[PDB]
Amino acid sequence: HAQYVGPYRLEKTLGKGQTGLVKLGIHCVTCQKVAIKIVNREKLSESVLMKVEREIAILKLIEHPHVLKLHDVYENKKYLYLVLEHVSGGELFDYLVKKGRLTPKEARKFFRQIISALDFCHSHSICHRDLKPENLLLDERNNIRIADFGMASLQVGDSLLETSCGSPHYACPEVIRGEKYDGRKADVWSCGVILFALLVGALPFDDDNLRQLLEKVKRGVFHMPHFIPPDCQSLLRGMIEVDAARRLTLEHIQKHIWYIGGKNKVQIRSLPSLEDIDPDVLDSMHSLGCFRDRNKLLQDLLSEEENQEKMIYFLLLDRKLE
Amino acid sequence: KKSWFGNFINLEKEEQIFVVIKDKPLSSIKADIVHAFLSIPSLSHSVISQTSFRAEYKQKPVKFQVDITYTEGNGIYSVTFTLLSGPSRRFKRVVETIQAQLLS
Question: Which parts of the sequence carry Phosphoserine (chain B)?
């Protein structure tokens, strides 16, 4: 007998185990397809869930050609149901398997699509924090759509007994060590590892022993295959750089000669008074669980610091101008 | 199952609320809707099809449509509420009380 998530009828499983359970949903009136990621919420704390909702709130309001779109989130006592765009192209690395290794030009094409999505999400204060091949989906036209922005804290696991740790092959050392870190810097590192994989068909850091793999990651030493052109190599080394202070920023990546090749937005103002604050926008915001505290939201909009509260507000305000 | 973003924003060209009804024939479903309508004194409605209604709640009046459509499984139905004109907030409220009737 048929299970539903709001209007979506649940059908087959598209993905299972690690990286979570995913089901095909079919809208019972429009017959449109969606992918529904099912996440057990029993062990997630409230503040974790509120922090995630705030980020998802932003994602629900922005759009990029290489970011998988989220339609909604449904909640009961045990599960979150994340209702996502459905794509039909499989995974980027399925492609890399068939080819063994990508052409530099072809690697540059997908690389630009990724950097552009990262830049867009970062400039809206959204980091990925756990960028992996599984997150790199392909659409109808073989364009990348990146899954799971804003969802690193959900810890979608294979096992109820085992906590999901993230994929260490693609993680920067500061994430491995459990340190405070800049999510932007972590995405850059992960993005360098993925690029290395596109070009080489193998990982920079790999080992049959998990402890040894972690050592290798922290160490940052890897073999650069000689066929990789020297400008491209310097870009990989600037991304896969252990010192987070010296690691390349996105702006420097986009200015890199290899990035360029050789062929040849919401505006955050400040709210001086509460009289300036839009009541309709305030009510939209207050409808979210992460904003039950009306006064705390006002404080967060009236303060000088840039925060996700302001990001949502202005995204909603501009959405209202139309 | 509650939606996080159902009262947050509408990205779609039409503002809509869907309800899936599990164990009721079409006659029960229509009877639930009409009961809910009559239970709302400031709301008049009319019948515009064997499977659809128009209503108006009365500042600007909320005008909307209610459609019943058969899904394909045993028989499950869906009810679609479509805002024609008027404030969203008042529309959501009215729909909540109709929906509550439909679910019990």
Answer: 3
Give the residues across from A79 on adjacent strands: A40
By C-alpha distance, which of A92, A2, A93, A84 is closest to A39?
A: A84
Chain A residues with beta carbon closer than 8 angstroms to that of B69? 29
- Give the residue among A122, A98, A96 at the shortest CA–CA distance from A109: A96
- The CA distance from A287 to A271, in Å, is 21
Q: Do B1 and A75 touch (CB under 8 A)?
A: yes
Rg (CA), chain A: 21
**Closest alpha carbon to A5 in A62, A59, A84:** A84
Please state, in angstroms and rounded to a whole number, the distance separating the CA atoms of residues B18 and A19.
Answer: 30
Alpha-carbon distance A279 to A269, whole Å?
Answer: 17
The DSSP letter of residue A68 is P
Chain A partners of B2 at a C-beta cutoff of 8 Å?
A: 74-76
Q: A87-265 is classed in which CATH architecture?
A: Orthogonal Bundle (1.10)
Q: Which residues of A are marked as active site? A: 130
Indicate where chain A has its CATH 1.10.510.10 domain(s). Answer: 87-265
* CATH 3.30.200.20 residue spans of chain A: 1-86
The closest of A105, A257, A235, A123 to A184, measured between CA atoms, is A123
Question: Which amino acid is located at A178 in the chain?
Answer: G
Quickly tell me which residue has 């091949």 as its tokens: A133
The rounded distance, in Å, linking the Cα atoms of A76 and A54 is: 18
Among residues A276, A280, A271, the alpha carbon closest in space to that of A302 is found at A271
Nearest to A60 among B7, B9, B73 (CB): B9
Residues of B in contact with A4 (CB under 8 A): 20
Experimental approach was X-ray
Give the mutation candidate from B1, B4, B14 for the A interface (greatest A CB count, under 10 A): B4
* Contacts by A100-104, CB closer than 8 A, 24 or more apart: A100/A201, A101/A198, A101/A199, A101/A200, A101/A201, A102/A198, A102/A199, A102/A201, A104/A199, A104/A228, A104/A229, A104/A232
Place of tokens 């809509």: B16
